[PDB]
Amino acid sequence: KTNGNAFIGK
Amino acid sequence: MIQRTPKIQVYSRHPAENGKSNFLNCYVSGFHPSDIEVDLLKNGERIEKVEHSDLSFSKDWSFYLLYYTEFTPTEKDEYACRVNHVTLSQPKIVKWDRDM
Amino acid sequence: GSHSMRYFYTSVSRPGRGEPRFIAVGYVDDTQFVRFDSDAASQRMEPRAPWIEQEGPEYWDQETRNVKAQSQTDRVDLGTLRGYYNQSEDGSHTIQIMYGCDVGPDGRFLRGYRQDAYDGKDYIALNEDLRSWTAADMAAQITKRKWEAAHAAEQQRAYLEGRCVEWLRRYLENGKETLQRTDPPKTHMTHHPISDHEATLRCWALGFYPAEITLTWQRDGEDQTQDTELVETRPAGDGTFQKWAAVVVPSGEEQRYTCHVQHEGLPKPLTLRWE
C-alpha cells in the first residue's frame, strides 16, 4: 500500500 | 549535472540450447539521466516486439532497465544489443556470447 | 527470514515536450508487485505479481489516487527546486523518491525509510529514528523547515509503523507460496585460454532468489581483487537472478584458485574450482 498522507510540497 | 554511463550485459534467460525456446536479455544499469535508447539486434538488424521493465533505481540513485524478447537460438544467428545515452559519443554495441 | 516493501518513484521534466513523466514501482523483497507509468494507456496502478490481482476495486482506486497526487506534488516540486538552484526553464530535471519498511523473521517492524533525491543526488532523507530529517545542502534546508512546520516526519512514521508494515505482512501471507521461497544458485565454472601462458576462470551463479549473493575468488587461500572482474547481479526475467566473477590466471595454475559462493538458499556455502 502506498503512502497517501504526505503530499507536502518541498 | 553529473552524468553516469550505462553498464550493458547481453545474456539468455536460460542456458542456450539450439532449437529450444528462450529469452534474450539486455540489462542496462548504473546510468543517469533516465533517457536511454536500447535495441535488441538479430544479425545486425533491429528486433521488433521487444519488451522492457518499468524504470527503477539503486541506492546510488542510478537507473536500471531490462529489455527482452522471446527467441530460439541457432548456431548461426548473431545477437547483440545497441545502446545510446547522452554520456556516449556514439551507440555502444555489445554482442551476445553464449560461451562466457 | 527478513523482508522489505519498497516504492520507487521517478519524475522527469521534459521542457517544451509536455508535463513531467511519472513512474512508480512497488516491490516486496526482489519481487515487483505494482507499477504506474503516466505515459501508459491505463492511467491506473497496475498489478505485476499474481498474488496482488485478488485485491478489490477499492484497493486499486486508492492506489491510483495516491500515485496521481504524488505525480502532481512532484510536478510542483520540479518548479520549486529549479527555483532553489536558480536553474533555467529549458533543461530536463529529475526527482526520485524511495520509501518503505523492513520486517524481521518474527514479523516485527525493523526499520523504515524515506529518501528523496534531485538530479541523481541526495536531497533530503528521513533519519533512522523516523522523527527528523537530514538536508543534503542549503536548498534542502528550506524543504526541511517546511517539512518540520508540517509535521512530515510524524506523517512518515505513522505510515511506516502502521500501514507499511501491516500491508507488507498481508502480502507476505497472500504470496507465501512464492515470496517465502529461496532458490539456491546453480553454479558452474568456465575456462578460457586468453594466450599461451594465461587463462580466464569464470565462476557462474544462475537461477537464484533473493538477489543478494557473494562470489569470492582466492589463490592459495588468499582473497583476490587483482584481476577479479565482478558483474552486477542481473535479472533472468523469470523472477531469478544471475551473477559471475572472473579471474585471469597463469596457465597450468588453475587448481590454485577457488570461487566461494554465499547465498541464503544454500544449505552450506559452496567452494568451486577448475577440475
Author numbering:
A (entry chain C): 1 to 10
B (entry chain B): 0 to 99
C (entry chain A): 1 to 275
What's the publication's text?
Structures comprising of HLA-A*11:01 in complex with the IBV peptides NP511-520, M141-49 and NS1186-195 were solved at a resolution of 2.08, 2.95 and 1.82 Å, respectively.
The 10-mer NP511-520 peptide adopted a canonical conformation within the HLA-A*11:01 binding cleft, anchored by P2-Thr and P10-Lys. This flat conformation of the peptide is similar to the one observed for the HLA-A*02:01-restricted IAV M158-66 peptide. Structural overlay of the bound NP511-520 and M141-49 peptides, with an average root mean square deviation (r.m.s.d.) of 1.52 Å, showed that despite sharing a similar backbone conformation, the overall peptide conformations are different due to the exposed side chains. The antigen binding cleft of HLA-A*11:01 for both structures adopted a similar conformation with an average r.m.s.d. of 0.45 Å. The conservation of IBV peptides was 99.9% for M141-49 and NS1186-195 and 90.7% for NP511-520 across all IBVs from both the Yamagata and Victoria lineages detected from 1936–2019. The lower conservation observed in NP511-520 is predominantly due to variations in position 3 residue 513N, which was more commonly observed in years prior to 2008, and from 2008 onwards, 513S became the dominant strain.
